């Protein structure tokens, strides 16, 4: 053991999300927590759209309502294992509109974050079935007090969304995704730059497998504030356990103080 | 032959910039044009601060005044060699304030861009000598009509500065630098992500060698809209010649239409 206060042990579950089946998805997650959880794990990370996957045409019926089913499911697991869960995202109906809603729950079973994906793919029938988020991603604390941020899949292409959480003090950016195999290089390259430009840890938690339409990339990855690899996965399903040296954030921010030079009001 | 606007041949001059000596830097540049130019080259790119390098304490006496020396020097080369020159940047005085001023000149001797570096390096103590720019980087046209943008060194760490020129239609981002060897990984990782997130060509033109304080990386590179390597150099002083398939920009923008999803009023 290392004395507490400078590290965080993270498990990334690179799950093969079942197309349009919330009960098979919930069973798989329960089984992954049972097989993999230990007293030393601080945070578990789940991929994007873990309840129904990309079964967009059936979300009008299959999606959750006000995170009812998904929050209760995650709260039960968080409390049972006394662990924080950066609970990917879920297809969620709110006031007769379908959102791609990310959320996190702490070890005390409290909802700590809720965020609807701001950036819809104007190609992936996402404009046909989903509604774009109307709020920025806000920094929030994990159980150790560490400020973090949670963004979803396509959001990775938008450097603007991470700037506000980074300058507010966020130390870890959790990107939750179902990133295609066809754009694997983009996934690693963008996550690495998000880490460097904001001097912070970046965790990319991706899904894997084929859903009858799209082959997902797998290849979940952890990048430190310097842009160096902490740990990674391949295409196949598995868990990734990393121990993050949190001190590297303030160290990187002292060495390359980008936010002392930012010109917020100038950029067009 | 291919229709005008679909192709461009670019030469990148990875020069070892002489510390605080404008006359020797001009002699070296003239020698490189004489030795390297040919009738097929459309654009020549120089590194950042090519007149005095980083001799900050002597800029009050050594810097140019209102681009007088630098513009006349470059106008002569652009007109003699019938080529566009993305003239890196120079230490430049305006009303007793010293700027790091990038400029470009077309083959007809016209000044086509003037940009004062917006992001000064506090660790290099640039704020004690230089004045930060008051304007954004504006897209400008090269002789073939292609919209491009010119950014300086430390600007690379600020993703915001490239967003407006890219959404305005810029196809090439020219980053002109004196990037240190100690941050080589950051140079490659950031240039690659700027290309991907904006679906455009990125040309990183860097200096090389040792100025008596810092070892510069060299490693100039060209990245296509898909994030793939077009061409690159190593540490050594050399010229990089690349052929750009400009049609790749609009093709990439059609395939990954990020600016149809951008939420300009939302971001904090
Ligand atoms: Cl001027
Ligand atoms: Cl001509
Ligand atoms: Cl041209
Ligand atoms: Cl730097």
Short mmCIF file of C-alpha atoms and ligand atoms in Angstrom, two decimals:
data_model
loop_
_atom_site.label_atom_id
_atom_site.label_comp_id
_atom_site.label_asym_id
_atom_site.label_seq_id
_atom_site.Cartn_x
_atom_site.Cartn_y
_atom_site.Cartn_z
CA UNK A 1 0.00 0.00 0.00
CA UNK A 2 0.91 3.68 -0.51
CA UNK A 3 -0.46 6.30 2.03
CA UNK A 4 -3.78 7.72 0.80
CA UNK A 5 -4.07 11.21 -0.69
CA UNK A 6 -2.13 11.09 -3.96
CA UNK A 7 -3.51 8.04 -5.83
CA UNK A 8 -6.78 6.57 -7.24
CA UNK A 9 -7.28 2.96 -8.40
CA UNK A 10 -9.61 2.82 -11.49
CA UNK A 11 -11.25 -0.20 -13.17
CA UNK A 12 -12.40 0.35 -16.78
CA UNK A 13 -15.00 -2.21 -17.94
CA UNK A 14 -14.63 -2.62 -21.77
CA UNK A 15 -17.97 -4.42 -22.07
CA UNK A 16 -19.48 -5.89 -25.26
CA UNK A 17 -22.81 -3.94 -24.95
CA UNK A 18 -25.84 -6.01 -26.11
CA UNK A 19 -27.95 -4.30 -28.84
CA UNK A 20 -31.34 -3.08 -27.48
CA UNK A 21 -31.42 -5.33 -24.38
CA UNK A 22 -31.36 -3.57 -20.97
CA UNK A 23 -31.87 -6.79 -18.94
CA UNK A 24 -28.91 -8.64 -20.66
CA UNK A 25 -26.79 -5.50 -20.21
CA UNK A 26 -27.66 -5.19 -16.49
CA UNK A 27 -26.91 -8.92 -15.96
CA UNK A 28 -23.44 -8.56 -17.66
CA UNK A 29 -22.57 -5.46 -15.52
CA UNK A 30 -23.67 -7.22 -12.25
CA UNK A 31 -21.48 -10.24 -13.29
CA UNK A 32 -18.47 -7.95 -14.06
CA UNK A 33 -18.67 -6.24 -10.62
CA UNK A 34 -19.01 -9.68 -8.92
CA UNK A 35 -15.96 -11.15 -10.76
CA UNK A 36 -13.70 -8.02 -10.67
CA UNK A 37 -14.41 -5.84 -7.60
CA UNK A 38 -11.96 -5.64 -4.63
CA UNK A 39 -11.71 -3.48 -1.44
CA UNK A 40 -8.89 -1.31 -3.01
CA UNK A 41 -10.83 -0.18 -6.18
CA UNK A 42 -11.98 3.50 -5.94
CA UNK A 43 -13.84 3.95 -9.30
CA UNK A 44 -15.44 1.68 -11.96
CA UNK A 45 -16.04 3.13 -15.43
CA UNK A 46 -18.72 1.94 -17.85
CA UNK A 47 -19.01 2.63 -21.65
CA UNK A 48 -21.52 4.90 -23.51
CA UNK A 49 -25.19 3.78 -23.99
CA UNK A 50 -24.84 0.63 -21.84
CA UNK A 51 -28.61 -0.01 -21.45
CA UNK A 52 -29.77 -0.30 -25.14
CA UNK A 53 -26.64 0.30 -27.19
CA UNK A 54 -27.37 1.87 -30.57
CA UNK A 55 -30.96 0.53 -31.04
CA UNK A 56 -32.17 4.06 -31.82
CA UNK A 57 -35.34 3.10 -33.68
CA UNK A 58 -36.74 1.36 -30.55
CA UNK A 59 -35.66 3.92 -27.83
CA UNK A 60 -39.14 5.55 -27.89
CA UNK A 61 -40.13 2.39 -25.83
CA UNK A 62 -36.77 0.80 -24.67
CA UNK A 63 -35.14 3.93 -23.15
CA UNK A 64 -35.25 4.76 -19.41
CA UNK A 65 -37.49 7.56 -17.95
CA UNK A 66 -35.76 10.22 -15.80
CA UNK A 67 -32.88 7.73 -15.20
CA UNK A 68 -35.36 5.62 -13.12
CA UNK A 69 -34.11 2.07 -13.89
CA UNK A 70 -30.44 3.03 -14.56
CA UNK A 71 -29.86 5.18 -11.43
CA UNK A 72 -31.51 2.56 -9.18
CA UNK A 73 -29.36 -0.19 -10.75
CA UNK A 74 -26.10 1.81 -10.35
CA UNK A 75 -26.95 3.12 -6.81
CA UNK A 76 -27.44 -0.52 -5.70
CA UNK A 77 -24.00 -1.51 -7.10
CA UNK A 78 -22.20 1.62 -5.74
CA UNK A 79 -23.61 1.02 -2.20
CA UNK A 80 -23.07 -2.80 -2.34
CA UNK A 81 -19.35 -2.51 -3.30
CA UNK A 82 -18.77 0.94 -1.63
CA UNK A 83 -17.26 2.26 -4.89
CA UNK A 84 -17.76 5.35 -7.14
CA UNK A 85 -19.15 4.57 -10.55
CA UNK A 86 -18.67 6.80 -13.60
CA UNK A 87 -21.75 5.05 -15.08
CA UNK A 88 -21.11 5.60 -18.85
CA UNK A 89 -24.32 6.82 -20.42
CA UNK A 90 -27.88 5.57 -21.03
CA UNK A 91 -30.72 6.16 -23.54
CA UNK A 92 -33.02 8.29 -21.37
CA UNK A 93 -36.44 9.85 -21.99
CA UNK A 94 -37.11 13.21 -20.32
CA UNK A 95 -40.21 15.40 -21.04
CA UNK A 96 -40.99 13.37 -24.21
CA UNK A 97 -37.47 13.66 -25.72
CA UNK A 98 -34.74 10.97 -25.93
CA UNK A 99 -31.22 11.92 -24.64
CA UNK A 100 -27.86 10.13 -24.40
CA UNK A 101 -27.44 10.71 -20.64
CA UNK A 102 -24.18 10.21 -18.77
CA UNK A 103 -24.29 9.98 -14.98
CA UNK A 104 -22.08 9.04 -12.02
CA UNK A 105 -22.93 7.83 -8.50
CA UNK A 106 -20.64 7.93 -5.43
CA UNK A 107 -20.02 5.12 -2.81
CA UNK A 108 -22.79 6.65 -0.62
CA UNK A 109 -25.36 5.98 -3.41
CA UNK A 110 -25.66 9.68 -4.26
CA UNK A 111 -26.11 10.96 -7.81
CA UNK A 112 -23.02 13.16 -8.42
CA UNK A 113 -23.36 14.03 -12.14
CA UNK A 114 -25.95 14.05 -14.95
CA UNK A 115 -25.05 15.20 -18.47
CA UNK A 116 -26.79 14.79 -21.87
CA UNK A 117 -24.45 14.42 -24.86
CA UNK A 118 -24.16 17.92 -26.46
CA UNK A 119 -22.77 16.71 -29.80
CA UNK A 120 -25.05 14.48 -31.88
CA UNK A 121 -23.67 12.81 -35.00
CA UNK A 122 -25.50 14.57 -37.90
CA UNK A 123 -24.96 11.20 -39.76
CA UNK A 124 -25.76 8.33 -37.27
CA UNK A 125 -29.64 8.80 -37.41
CA UNK A 126 -28.91 10.56 -34.07
CA UNK A 127 -30.73 13.68 -35.30
CA UNK A 128 -33.64 11.36 -36.39
CA UNK A 129 -34.04 9.79 -32.87
CA UNK A 130 -32.08 11.73 -30.20
CA UNK A 131 -32.12 15.27 -28.73
CA UNK A 132 -28.85 17.26 -28.15
CA UNK A 133 -27.90 18.26 -24.58
CA UNK A 134 -28.55 21.87 -23.56
CA UNK A 135 -25.95 22.14 -20.78
CA UNK A 136 -22.15 22.20 -20.55
CA UNK A 137 -20.34 19.39 -18.73
CA UNK A 138 -19.76 20.59 -15.13
CA UNK A 139 -16.83 19.49 -12.90
CA UNK A 140 -17.88 17.25 -9.98
CA UNK A 141 -16.13 15.50 -7.08
CA UNK A 142 -15.45 11.80 -6.61
CA UNK A 143 -15.48 10.40 -3.02
CA UNK A 144 -11.80 11.44 -2.33
CA UNK A 145 -12.68 15.08 -3.23
CA UNK A 146 -10.90 14.95 -6.65
CA UNK A 147 -12.70 17.16 -9.29
CA UNK A 148 -13.42 15.24 -12.51
CA UNK A 149 -15.49 15.54 -15.71
CA UNK A 150 -17.48 13.06 -17.78
CA UNK A 151 -17.96 13.49 -21.61
CA UNK A 152 -19.56 11.16 -24.17
CA UNK A 153 -18.08 9.60 -27.38
CA UNK A 154 -18.49 12.21 -30.24
CA UNK A 155 -17.85 15.02 -27.67
CA UNK A 156 -14.14 13.94 -27.94
CA UNK A 157 -13.96 15.74 -31.31
CA UNK A 158 -14.93 19.09 -29.63
CA UNK A 159 -11.92 20.54 -27.72
CA UNK A 160 -14.15 23.40 -26.43
CA UNK A 161 -16.19 21.14 -24.10
CA UNK A 162 -13.20 20.15 -21.87
CA UNK A 163 -11.70 23.68 -21.49
CA UNK A 164 -14.13 24.96 -18.81
CA UNK A 165 -13.84 21.81 -16.56
CA UNK A 166 -10.02 21.84 -16.99
CA UNK A 167 -9.55 25.53 -16.03
CA UNK A 168 -11.98 25.03 -13.08
CA UNK A 169 -9.63 22.37 -11.65
CA UNK A 170 -10.84 19.00 -13.12
CA UNK A 171 -7.95 16.45 -12.84
CA UNK A 172 -9.48 13.51 -14.77
CA UNK A 173 -11.57 13.62 -17.97
CA UNK A 174 -13.63 10.44 -18.37
CA UNK A 175 -14.65 9.96 -22.02
CA UNK A 176 -17.33 7.19 -22.20
CA UNK A 177 -17.82 5.71 -25.66
CA UNK A 178 -19.01 3.26 -28.31
CA UNK A 179 -16.27 4.46 -30.66
CA UNK A 180 -16.15 2.70 -34.10
CA UNK A 181 -13.26 0.43 -35.22
CA UNK A 182 -13.19 2.51 -38.45
CA UNK A 183 -11.96 5.61 -36.41
CA UNK A 184 -9.54 3.86 -33.98
CA UNK A 185 -6.55 6.17 -34.82
CA UNK A 186 -8.79 9.26 -34.13
CA UNK A 187 -9.76 7.84 -30.69
CA UNK A 188 -6.11 7.45 -29.47
CA UNK A 189 -4.88 10.73 -31.09
CA UNK A 190 -7.68 12.95 -29.71
CA UNK A 191 -7.55 11.45 -26.17
CA UNK A 192 -3.75 12.07 -26.09
CA UNK A 193 -4.10 15.74 -27.10
CA UNK A 194 -7.00 16.36 -24.67
CA UNK A 195 -4.61 15.18 -21.91
CA UNK A 196 -1.68 17.41 -23.02
CA UNK A 197 -3.56 20.63 -23.85
CA UNK A 198 -5.42 20.54 -20.49
CA UNK A 199 -2.44 19.07 -18.44
CA UNK A 200 -4.67 16.32 -17.00
CA UNK A 201 -5.46 12.60 -16.89
CA UNK A 202 -7.66 11.32 -19.73
CA UNK A 203 -9.51 7.96 -19.52
CA UNK A 204 -11.23 6.65 -22.62
CA UNK A 205 -13.69 3.85 -21.72
CA UNK A 206 -14.95 2.17 -24.87
CA UNK A 207 -17.29 -0.70 -25.76
CA UNK A 208 -16.36 -3.62 -28.05
CA UNK A 209 -17.92 -6.11 -30.48
CA UNK A 210 -20.37 -5.96 -33.40
CA UNK A 211 -24.06 -4.96 -32.89
CA UNK A 212 -25.40 -6.02 -36.32
CA UNK A 213 -24.58 -2.58 -37.82
CA UNK A 214 -21.30 -1.27 -36.32
CA UNK A 215 -18.03 -2.84 -35.19
CA UNK A 216 -16.80 -1.07 -32.02
CA UNK A 217 -13.10 -0.42 -31.41
CA UNK A 218 -12.44 -1.58 -27.85
CA UNK A 219 -8.93 -0.18 -27.13
CA UNK A 220 -9.83 1.67 -23.87
CA UNK A 221 -6.88 3.83 -22.71
CA UNK A 222 -5.51 5.91 -19.82
CA UNK A 223 -3.22 8.91 -20.65
CA UNK A 224 -1.35 10.95 -18.00
CA UNK A 225 -1.00 14.84 -17.87
CA UNK A 226 2.22 14.58 -19.96
CA UNK A 227 0.50 12.68 -22.76
CA UNK A 228 2.11 9.32 -21.81
CA UNK A 229 0.36 5.92 -21.78
CA UNK A 230 -0.60 4.73 -18.25
CA UNK A 231 -2.44 1.60 -19.53
CA UNK A 232 -4.49 0.27 -22.49
CA UNK A 233 -6.60 -2.57 -23.89
CA UNK A 234 -6.95 -4.24 -27.29
CA UNK A 235 -10.19 -4.97 -29.28
CA UNK A 236 -11.32 -7.93 -27.09
CA UNK A 237 -13.52 -7.53 -23.94
CA UNK A 238 -11.64 -7.18 -20.57
CA UNK A 239 -11.12 -4.83 -17.57
CA UNK A 240 -8.29 -2.27 -17.23
CA UNK A 241 -6.96 -1.46 -13.76
CA UNK A 242 -4.79 1.65 -13.36
CA UNK A 243 -3.31 3.47 -10.35
CA UNK A 244 -3.27 7.19 -11.07
CA UNK A 245 -0.58 9.41 -9.53
CA UNK A 246 -2.92 12.48 -9.01
CA UNK A 247 0.06 14.71 -8.01
CA UNK A 248 1.12 14.68 -11.74
CA UNK A 249 -1.76 17.13 -12.51
CA UNK A 250 -0.64 20.01 -10.26
CA UNK A 251 3.00 19.15 -11.30
CA UNK A 252 2.12 19.43 -15.06
CA UNK A 253 0.07 22.63 -14.46
CA UNK A 254 3.04 24.23 -12.61
CA UNK A 255 5.49 23.25 -15.44
CA UNK A 256 3.23 24.30 -18.40
CA UNK A 257 0.83 26.93 -16.96
CA UNK A 258 -1.47 27.22 -20.05
CA UNK A 259 -4.40 28.78 -18.14
CA UNK A 260 -2.26 31.79 -17.12
CA UNK A 261 -2.01 32.55 -20.92
CA UNK A 262 -5.56 31.72 -22.12
CA UNK A 263 -7.49 34.58 -23.75
CA UNK A 264 -11.13 33.47 -23.13
CA UNK A 265 -12.89 36.57 -24.50
CA UNK A 266 -10.61 36.98 -27.55
CA UNK A 267 -11.31 33.71 -29.43
CA UNK A 268 -13.93 33.86 -32.18
CA UNK B 1 -2.36 18.29 -64.45
CA UNK B 2 -5.27 18.51 -61.94
CA UNK B 3 -7.71 21.48 -61.54
CA UNK B 4 -6.22 24.48 -59.75
CA UNK B 5 -7.13 24.26 -56.06
CA UNK B 6 -6.84 20.46 -55.78
CA UNK B 7 -3.03 20.37 -55.49
CA UNK B 8 -0.20 22.31 -53.82
CA UNK B 9 3.53 21.65 -53.55
CA UNK B 10 5.02 22.97 -50.26
CA UNK B 11 8.66 23.31 -49.17
CA UNK B 12 9.36 23.49 -45.42
CA UNK B 13 12.67 25.05 -44.37
CA UNK B 14 13.76 23.45 -41.07
CA UNK B 15 16.45 26.08 -40.42
CA UNK B 16 18.97 26.38 -37.54
CA UNK B 17 18.12 30.01 -36.53
CA UNK B 18 21.17 32.17 -35.65
CA UNK B 19 20.76 33.63 -32.10
CA UNK B 20 20.30 37.42 -32.29
CA UNK B 21 21.66 37.95 -35.82
CA UNK B 22 19.21 39.22 -38.43
CA UNK B 23 21.80 39.71 -41.22
CA UNK B 24 23.13 36.08 -40.89
CA UNK B 25 19.58 34.67 -40.72
CA UNK B 26 18.76 36.53 -43.96
CA UNK B 27 21.99 35.24 -45.60
CA UNK B 28 21.10 31.64 -44.56
CA UNK B 29 17.46 32.01 -45.83
CA UNK B 30 18.62 33.49 -49.21
CA UNK B 31 21.12 30.56 -49.55
CA UNK B 32 18.31 28.03 -48.87
CA UNK B 33 16.05 29.63 -51.55
CA UNK B 34 18.96 29.60 -54.10
CA UNK B 35 19.89 25.93 -53.40
CA UNK B 36 16.35 24.50 -52.93
CA UNK B 37 13.75 26.37 -55.02
CA UNK B 38 12.29 24.93 -58.23
CA UNK B 39 9.45 25.95 -60.67
CA UNK B 40 6.92 23.44 -59.14
CA UNK B 41 7.01 24.79 -55.55
CA UNK B 42 3.84 26.84 -54.66
CA UNK B 43 4.69 27.74 -51.02
CA UNK B 44 7.80 28.03 -48.83
CA UNK B 45 7.42 28.01 -44.98
CA UNK B 46 9.97 29.42 -42.45
CA UNK B 47 10.15 28.83 -38.65
CA UNK B 48 9.12 31.17 -35.80
CA UNK B 49 11.31 34.23 -34.80
CA UNK B 50 13.69 33.78 -37.75
CA UNK B 51 15.34 37.24 -37.53
CA UNK B 52 16.73 37.25 -33.92
CA UNK B 53 15.60 33.93 -32.53
CA UNK B 54 15.13 34.09 -28.75
CA UNK B 55 17.58 36.95 -27.93
CA UNK B 56 14.81 38.62 -25.87
CA UNK B 57 16.95 41.08 -23.86
CA UNK B 58 18.39 42.70 -27.05
CA UNK B 59 15.12 42.98 -29.07
CA UNK B 60 14.74 46.69 -28.18
CA UNK B 61 17.74 47.33 -30.48
CA UNK B 62 17.64 44.23 -32.82
CA UNK B 63 13.91 43.72 -33.62
CA UNK B 64 12.32 44.95 -36.87
CA UNK B 65 10.11 48.07 -36.84
CA UNK B 66 6.61 47.70 -38.34
CA UNK B 67 7.86 44.72 -40.48
CA UNK B 68 10.02 47.20 -42.51
CA UNK B 69 13.14 45.01 -42.86
CA UNK B 70 11.38 41.63 -42.83
CA UNK B 71 8.62 42.48 -45.31
CA UNK B 72 11.13 44.06 -47.79
CA UNK B 73 13.43 40.94 -47.44
CA UNK B 74 10.54 38.45 -48.01
CA UNK B 75 8.83 40.56 -50.81
CA UNK B 76 12.16 40.37 -52.72
CA UNK B 77 12.38 36.53 -52.38
CA UNK B 78 8.65 35.98 -53.18
CA UNK B 79 8.95 38.13 -56.35
CA UNK B 80 12.39 36.73 -57.49
CA UNK B 81 11.41 33.07 -56.95
CA UNK B 82 7.69 33.60 -57.93
CA UNK B 83 6.51 31.74 -54.81
CA UNK B 84 4.16 32.38 -51.81
CA UNK B 85 6.05 32.57 -48.50
CA UNK B 86 4.45 31.76 -45.12
CA UNK B 87 7.27 33.78 -43.52
CA UNK B 88 7.32 32.20 -40.04
CA UNK B 89 7.47 35.08 -37.54
CA UNK B 90 9.84 37.91 -36.56
CA UNK B 91 10.58 40.00 -33.45
CA UNK B 92 8.79 43.23 -34.35
CA UNK B 93 8.44 46.70 -32.75
CA UNK B 94 5.36 48.90 -33.03
CA UNK B 95 5.25 52.08 -30.83
CA UNK B 96 7.87 50.82 -28.32
CA UNK B 97 6.07 47.45 -27.81
CA UNK B 98 7.78 44.23 -29.11
CA UNK B 99 5.64 41.52 -30.77
CA UNK B 100 6.24 38.04 -32.14
CA UNK B 101 4.75 38.78 -35.59
CA UNK B 102 3.93 36.13 -38.15
CA UNK B 103 3.36 37.28 -41.72
CA UNK B 104 2.92 35.85 -45.20
CA UNK B 105 3.62 37.31 -48.63
CA UNK B 106 2.22 36.07 -52.00
CA UNK B 107 4.32 35.58 -55.21
CA UNK B 108 3.10 39.04 -56.43
CA UNK B 109 4.85 40.69 -53.41
CA UNK B 110 1.59 41.55 -51.58
CA UNK B 111 1.43 41.27 -47.74
CA UNK B 112 -1.40 38.67 -47.18
CA UNK B 113 -1.26 38.06 -43.40
CA UNK B 114 0.05 39.74 -40.23
CA UNK B 115 -0.51 38.08 -36.87
CA UNK B 116 0.91 38.88 -33.39
CA UNK B 117 1.34 35.77 -31.22
CA UNK B 118 -1.54 35.71 -28.74
CA UNK B 119 -0.13 33.23 -26.16
CA UNK B 120 3.17 34.22 -24.57
CA UNK B 121 5.28 31.63 -22.63
CA UNK B 122 5.48 32.73 -18.91
CA UNK B 123 8.19 30.19 -18.06
CA UNK B 124 10.46 31.58 -20.87
CA UNK B 125 9.69 35.04 -19.28
CA UNK B 126 8.35 36.36 -22.69
CA UNK B 127 6.01 38.73 -20.74
CA UNK B 128 9.06 40.67 -19.46
CA UNK B 129 10.02 41.57 -23.04
CA UNK B 130 7.18 40.89 -25.50
CA UNK B 131 3.58 42.11 -25.90
CA UNK B 132 0.78 39.59 -26.56
CA UNK B 133 -1.33 40.00 -29.69
CA UNK B 134 -4.75 41.72 -29.56
CA UNK B 135 -6.36 39.89 -32.55
CA UNK B 136 -7.40 36.37 -33.56
CA UNK B 137 -5.66 34.46 -36.40
CA UNK B 138 -7.70 35.34 -39.55
CA UNK B 139 -7.96 32.99 -42.57
CA UNK B 140 -6.22 34.34 -45.71
CA UNK B 141 -5.87 33.24 -49.34
CA UNK B 142 -2.74 31.93 -51.04
CA UNK B 143 -2.15 32.64 -54.81
CA UNK B 144 -4.22 29.59 -55.86
CA UNK B 145 -7.09 31.02 -53.71
CA UNK B 146 -6.85 28.37 -50.92
CA UNK B 147 -7.87 29.67 -47.46
CA UNK B 148 -5.17 29.00 -44.83
CA UNK B 149 -4.20 30.15 -41.34
CA UNK B 150 -0.87 30.88 -39.66
CA UNK B 151 -0.29 30.20 -35.90
CA UNK B 152 2.84 30.55 -33.72
CA UNK B 153 4.58 27.89 -31.57
CA UNK B 154 2.94 28.03 -28.05
CA UNK B 155 -0.42 28.74 -29.88
CA UNK B 156 -0.37 24.99 -30.62
CA UNK B 157 -1.40 24.29 -26.96
CA UNK B 158 -4.62 26.44 -27.39
CA UNK B 159 -7.20 24.50 -29.46
CA UNK B 160 -9.56 27.53 -29.42
CA UNK B 161 -7.38 29.60 -31.79
CA UNK B 162 -7.75 27.15 -34.76
CA UNK B 163 -11.55 26.74 -34.40
CA UNK B 164 -12.70 29.98 -36.05
CA UNK B 165 -10.35 29.71 -39.14
CA UNK B 166 -11.37 26.01 -39.63
CA UNK B 167 -15.12 26.71 -39.42
CA UNK B 168 -14.52 29.69 -41.83
CA UNK B 169 -13.16 27.15 -44.37
CA UNK B 170 -9.34 27.18 -43.86
CA UNK B 171 -7.81 24.04 -45.44
CA UNK B 172 -4.24 24.31 -44.08
CA UNK B 173 -2.99 25.37 -40.66
CA UNK B 174 0.62 26.52 -40.70
CA UNK B 175 2.18 26.32 -37.23
CA UNK B 176 5.56 28.12 -37.22
CA UNK B 177 7.76 27.27 -34.24
CA UNK B 178 11.01 27.06 -32.29
CA UNK B 179 9.60 24.07 -30.36
CA UNK B 180 12.02 22.57 -27.74
CA UNK B 181 13.45 19.01 -28.00
CA UNK B 182 12.26 18.47 -24.40
CA UNK B 183 8.58 18.68 -25.58
CA UNK B 184 8.92 16.69 -28.88
CA UNK B 185 6.09 14.25 -27.99
CA UNK B 186 3.74 17.27 -27.32
CA UNK B 187 4.61 18.78 -30.80
CA UNK B 188 3.65 15.61 -32.74
CA UNK B 189 0.59 14.72 -30.57
CA UNK B 190 -0.92 18.19 -30.67
CA UNK B 191 -0.36 18.75 -34.44
CA UNK B 192 -2.07 15.42 -35.20
CA UNK B 193 -5.14 16.28 -33.07
CA UNK B 194 -5.48 19.80 -34.56
CA UNK B 195 -5.65 18.14 -38.01
CA UNK B 196 -8.31 15.56 -36.90
CA UNK B 197 -10.60 17.77 -34.80
CA UNK B 198 -10.77 20.44 -37.62
CA UNK B 199 -10.64 17.92 -40.57
CA UNK B 200 -7.77 19.84 -42.23
CA UNK B 201 -4.11 19.70 -43.23
CA UNK B 202 -1.64 20.73 -40.49
CA UNK B 203 1.95 21.76 -41.31
CA UNK B 204 4.31 22.06 -38.38
CA UNK B 205 7.44 24.03 -39.45
CA UNK B 206 10.06 23.93 -36.74
CA UNK B 207 13.62 25.22 -36.29
CA UNK B 208 16.52 23.00 -35.18
CA UNK B 209 19.87 23.09 -33.36
CA UNK B 210 21.12 24.81 -30.22
CA UNK B 211 20.97 28.62 -29.70
CA UNK B 212 23.16 28.58 -26.56
CA UNK B 213 20.26 27.98 -24.09
CA UNK B 214 17.69 25.65 -25.72
CA UNK B 215 17.96 22.60 -27.99
CA UNK B 216 15.20 22.85 -30.62
CA UNK B 217 13.42 19.66 -31.80
CA UNK B 218 13.41 20.01 -35.56
CA UNK B 219 10.98 17.16 -36.50
CA UNK B 220 8.86 19.32 -38.88
CA UNK B 221 5.78 17.38 -40.02
CA UNK B 222 2.77 17.46 -42.36
CA UNK B 223 -0.52 15.78 -41.26
CA UNK B 224 -3.50 15.23 -43.56
CA UNK B 225 -7.24 15.83 -42.61
CA UNK B 226 -7.56 12.16 -41.55
CA UNK B 227 -4.65 12.55 -39.09
CA UNK B 228 -2.23 10.57 -41.24
CA UNK B 229 1.42 11.39 -41.86
CA UNK B 230 2.05 13.11 -45.24
CA UNK B 231 5.81 13.74 -44.62
CA UNK B 232 8.29 14.43 -41.78
CA UNK B 233 11.86 15.41 -40.94
CA UNK B 234 14.14 14.36 -38.06
CA UNK B 235 16.41 16.54 -35.79
CA UNK B 236 18.77 17.61 -38.65
CA UNK B 237 18.53 20.91 -40.60
CA UNK B 238 16.82 20.05 -43.88
CA UNK B 239 14.02 20.81 -46.35
CA UNK B 240 10.75 18.86 -46.41
CA UNK B 241 8.85 18.86 -49.72
CA UNK B 242 5.23 17.64 -49.72
CA UNK B 243 2.42 17.39 -52.30
CA UNK B 244 -0.96 18.12 -50.81
CA UNK B 245 -4.19 16.65 -52.10
CA UNK B 246 -6.40 19.62 -51.03
CA UNK B 247 -9.61 17.78 -52.04
CA UNK B 248 -9.02 15.66 -48.85
CA UNK B 249 -10.29 18.56 -46.69
CA UNK B 250 -13.83 18.85 -48.17
CA UNK B 251 -13.95 14.98 -48.40
CA UNK B 252 -13.09 14.71 -44.66
CA UNK B 253 -15.57 17.48 -43.73
CA UNK B 254 -18.33 15.67 -45.66
CA UNK B 255 -17.49 12.36 -43.91
CA UNK B 256 -17.11 13.82 -40.35
CA UNK B 257 -19.25 17.02 -40.36
CA UNK B 258 -18.22 18.35 -36.95
CA UNK B 259 -19.23 22.00 -37.63
CA UNK B 260 -22.86 20.95 -38.19
CA UNK B 261 -22.81 19.78 -34.52
CA UNK B 262 -20.81 22.68 -32.94
CA UNK B 263 -22.60 24.60 -30.10
CA UNK B 264 -20.83 27.98 -30.20
CA UNK B 265 -23.21 29.73 -27.73
CA UNK B 266 -23.15 26.87 -25.23
CA UNK B 267 -19.46 26.40 -24.23
CA UNK B 268 -18.13 28.08 -21.04
CL1 LIG C 1 3.73 45.89 -38.14
CL1 LIG C 2 3.11 33.26 -62.91
CL1 LIG C 3 -0.58 29.14 -53.85
CL1 LIG C 4 5.80 24.15 -24.86
#
